[PDB]
């Protein structure tokens, strides 16, 4: 396949994919546990824009 999950997201190095730091929500990823690649936004922004229009 041309596009993999690794091409869209990357696990946050700070919270090791957890989203919380010993209870409190992670700063770096902002509670998402993953940080998105440019390819990821590209699609997400695209979809979010035109969906249900």
């Amino acid at each position: 396949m041309v596009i993999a999950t690794d091409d869209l997201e990357v696990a946050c190095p700070k919270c090791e994919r957890a989203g919380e730091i010993e209870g409190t929500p992670c700063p770096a990823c902002s509670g998402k546990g993953v940080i998105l690649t440019a390819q990821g936004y590209t699609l997400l922004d695209f979809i979010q824009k035109h969906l249900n229009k």
């Binding site: 690794d6 946050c12 190095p13 700063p27 770096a28 940080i35 998105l36 690649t37």
Partner: protein, 70 residues
């Protein structure tokens, strides 16, 4: 303005943009697989760049080779 050259020497190198401002979080993380090259400037939004995984890097200060485990 000032920029960096990053050539991945293995699959799954991450170039991580750290946010400019009072707070320091990762707004973005680009993946590079073995051999891909990213050329990234410091911006109104990126005031620090973190590289992890084996990569060859060129800056205004000269070359440095990252060795990162993943």
């Amino acid at each position: 303005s000032d920029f960096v050259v990053i050539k991945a020497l293995e699959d799954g190198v991450n170039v991580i943009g750290l946010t400019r401002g009072a707070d320091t979080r990762f707004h973005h993380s680009e993946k590079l697989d073995k051999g891909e090259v990213l050329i990234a400037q410091f911006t109104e939004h990126t005031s620090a760049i973190k590289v992890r995984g084996k990569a060859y890097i060129q800056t205004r200060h000269g070359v440095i080779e990252s060795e990162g485990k993943k």
